[PDB]
Every structure is written in C-alpha cells, then in structure tokens.
Design brief:
1 chains; about 220 residues; mainly alpha; about 0% strand; rod-shaped
C-alpha cells in the first residue's frame, strides 16, 4: 500500500456519505407526505363512491343502474388500494431510508475517532519538523552545546516513533474502513432487495385483486 491512497479513500468516503445522508433526509420527507396523501386519496374516493350512489337514487333505469353499482364497488377497491399502498411502497422505503442513516450515522462516530487522531498527528509532525530544524540551526551557528543537541535528539527520536506508529495505524484503520465500506454497501443491497421482495409479493396480489375486481365488474 501507499499512504496517499489511504487518505484519498478517506476523503472520498467522508464526502460521499455526507452527500448521501443529506439526500436520505430529503427522501424521508417525501415519504411523510406520501402516507398523508394515501390516507386522503382514499377519502377522495369515498366522495367518489358517494356521488355514484347519490346518483343511483335519482336514476333507476334498469340497464344504467346495474353498471353504476358495479362501478361504485370498483371505486371502493381503488379506495382500498390507496389505503393498502401506504403500507406497501411508503412504509417499505421509509423504514430502509431511516436504516441507511443509522448505518452512515455509525460511520460518522467511527470517523470522529480517527479525526481526533489525525488532528494529533499533524501537531506531532509540526513539532518533529521544528526540532529537526533546531538541530540544523545549531550546526550553522558554528558553536553548539552538545548536551542540548542530544536533548533535542532524544525528542526527535521519540517523535519519529510516534509518527511511524501513528501512520501505521492510519493505514490499518483505512484497510478496516475499505472492508467496512465494502460490507456496508453489500448490506444496503440485501436491505433493499428484501424490502423489494416484500413489496413484489404484496403488490402482485393487490393488483391481481384489482384485475379480478375489474373482470367481475366488466362482465357487469
């Protein structure tokens, strides 16, 4: 591996899942309305049914009334599909969206853990560099106390270990992070796929039912 590449993967993940979290919040809001409308598309269709019935009282003629009731009932099936659909599509997406935020949301805590570590590392690197420059400065003074040169040496050497170790941890945190990303995405498909299946089944019956309703009331 290479140190640049590990940071390149860091900045990428952090930006991407910031875009995604804020995105997920917008799709969630979209859901909240969708439940609310499906609730009241249904009321929309209660009125609709009511008018058909309200018009079968003021006509009665034999070959118009028969279809007219069938149509009220048809409408009540559509009314019903609207109610159904809040728990099909709306509920299914709304639950997985919230869930993806939890998973991004956990990877924000994981980041913060590293991020304090990075912030410490830069202090450790600018301290090391200052010290390394102080030794150089003494050399071209022309006169050095060798005591202080050795006191600087000891702090230079301790900071060299601190940097070497800290950089090592960044790589393996990053390798973990790759595995983490790679796991995370795989889960997000499995999440969506099950959710989709749950939908697929329910949706096929709910519509099968509309078609059956249609046949009954087509044949009048």
């Amino acid at each position: 591996n290479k140190f640049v590449e590990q940071d390149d993967w860091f900045h990428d993940r952090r930006v991407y899942l910031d875009a995604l979290e804020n995105q997920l919040k917008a799709l969630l809001k979209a859901m909240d309305n969708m439940v609310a409308q499906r609730k009241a598309m249904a009321e929309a269709a209660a009125d609709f049914s009511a008018s058909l019935h309200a018009l079968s009282t003021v006509e009665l003629s034999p070959t118009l009334s028969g279809p007219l009731d069938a149509l009220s009932e048809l409408q009540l099936a559509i009314r019903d599909v609207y109610e159904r659909q809040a728990q099909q599509d709306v509920l299914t997406f709304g639950i997985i969206i919230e869930e993806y935020i939890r998973l991004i949301g956990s990877v924000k805590q994981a980041f913060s853990q590293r991020q304090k570590a990075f912030h410490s590392w830069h202090s450790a690197e600018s301290e090391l560099m200052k010290k390394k420059a102080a030794q150089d400065k003494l050399l071209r003074q022309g006169k050095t106390q060798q005591d202080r040169l050795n006191q600087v040496n000891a702090e230079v050497i301790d900071a060299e270990r601190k940097v070497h170790q800290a950089r090592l941890l960044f790589e393996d945190m990053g390798r973990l992070l790759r595995s983490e990303l790679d796991r995370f995405e795989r889960e997000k498909v499995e999440d969506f796929k099950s959710g989709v299946e749950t939908f697929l089944e329910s949706a096929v019956e709910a519509q099968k039912e509309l078609i059956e309703k249609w046949e009954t009331f087509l044949m009048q």
